[PDB]
Amino acid sequence: DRLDAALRFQQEALNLRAQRQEILAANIANADTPGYQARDIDFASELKKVMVVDLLYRVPDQPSLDGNTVDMDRERTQFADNSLKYQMGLTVLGSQLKGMMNVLQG
């Protein structure tokens, strides 16, 4: 359907933002697990792949003794950024749907 092609990009971006949000929250929740590696996804490459998931390990900053590589500050900033981008995607998708609607209303 042509309607899907117009809204495909924003829907895929929104779904990818939700998945990465879940991954970041999993990183936050498992901060205290000894031996847990902080995982993340490269948003742009996966968005290419879906439009046309694989988890990448985060490069550790400080060496802990229990093997936990989760850094609070980095993932807190990433979490806030992902929340903001999810809201922006919701706004853009809603604007596109509302425009398609006011075209029809009459």
Partner: protein, 49 residues
């Protein structure tokens, strides 16, 4: 030598200096712990969108 008993070799000057140093080090580490805890408490609000 017979008729003499050997006592301990605990130097009291070293013990007193060790106690003073240990007390000061403990207080420094407690201060560092408090600073780190307060910093994390302030930092854990960013997550609010």
């Amino acid at each position: 030598m017979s008729g003499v008993l050997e006592g301990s070799n605990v130097k009291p000057v070293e013990a007193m200096t060790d106690m003073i140093a240990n007390a000061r080090r403990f207080e420094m580490q407690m201060k560092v712990i408090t600073s780190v805890d307060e910093n994390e408490g302030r930092a854990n609000q960013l997550l609010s969108m």
